[PDB]
């Protein structure tokens, strides 16, 4: 299937308690592989996956260089935004950035990203064409004009279709036993009596990778959303994911229900029946 590399950064100002804290993380699909935290002692990009540890010292120097430069830029950007919006210096603000690339199943460039959010709301984003910007408001319009004049779009595009893709391909190969695996969900059902009149059927998906999954309950073949509880997909901590979906059933009507599971690691969707 396709693959992605993403870097996620968060800068949070802390009025009266020093300079903003900056945290960046890098992911290949659902697997984290690097981090940087401006508050940590090391002041270096650090490995967070086994397959990245084989990169040499020049990698670690250059990556540390780039992420430190980012940290400083976003520190400046937090100050610039305050001024644009005329917001009080006494309040904490957050600036988030995301960038990276998708490749298809044989490694060709599919899509690139480069976007910012300020206080949880989209600020500016490189459009899918990698040629123009979407600005969320009048402040981001100023930024948009600046980035237009500076030709930021073409600089980032060169990164996104070049280096981003090359790195993602290299990681996918180096971590192929980890990254190019699919772990199908281990599935089962549990039963939980509520009263003499009702019982809960919970359909489980465990130990799956990647995290993308769909779990659906049906009653007599009819898609059942009414009376279903669905938890957010959660990490197990070991590189795999978990999810469940439950329905409240009239006691004695358990056999009318089917749980349906879709996942990239399954050749065909599964149907589970109690």
């Amino acid at each position: 299937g396709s693959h992605s590399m993403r870097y996620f950064s968060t800068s949070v100002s802390r009025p009266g308690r020093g300079e903003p804290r900056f945290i960046a993380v890098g992911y290949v699909d659902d697997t984290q592989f690097v981090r940087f935290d401006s508050d940590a002692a090391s002041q270096r990009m650090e490995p967070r996956a086994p397959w990245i540890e084989q990169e040499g010292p020049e990698y670690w120097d250059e990556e540390t260089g780039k992420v430190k430069a980012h940290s400083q830029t976003d520190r400046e950007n937090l100050r610039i935004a305050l001024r644009y919006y005329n917001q009080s210096e006494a309040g904490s603000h957050t600036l988030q950035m995301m960038f990276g690339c998708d490749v298809g199943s044989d490694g060709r460039f599919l899509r690139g990203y480069h976007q910012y959010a300020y206080d949880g709301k989209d600020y500016i984003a490189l459009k899918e064409d990698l040629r123009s910007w979407t600005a969320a408001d009048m402040a981001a319009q100023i930024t948009k004009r600046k980035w237009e004049a500076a030709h930021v779009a073409e600089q980032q595009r060169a990164y996104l279709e070049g280096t981003c893709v090359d790195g993602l391909r290299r990681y996918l190969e180096n971590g192929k036993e980890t990254l190019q695996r699919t772990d199908p969900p281990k599935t089962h059902m549990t039963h939980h009596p509520i009263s003499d009149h009702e019982a809960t059927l919970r359909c489980w998906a465990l130990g799956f990778y990647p995290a993308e999954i769909t779990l659906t309950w049906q009653r007599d073949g009819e898609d059942q959303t009414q009376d279903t509880e669905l938890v957010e997909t959660r990490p197990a901590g070991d590189g795999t994911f978990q999810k469940w979906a439950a329905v409240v059933v009239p006691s004695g009507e358990e056999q009318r229900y089917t749980c349906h599971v879709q996942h990239e690691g399954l050749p065909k969707p599964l149907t589970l029946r109690w």
Binding site: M45, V67, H70, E76, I142, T163, C164
Partner: peptide, 10 residues
């Protein structure tokens, strides 16, 4: 691989 510089401010 991280995005290179230079960064351009807001």
């Amino acid at each position: 691989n991280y995005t290179p510089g230079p960064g351009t401010r807001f």
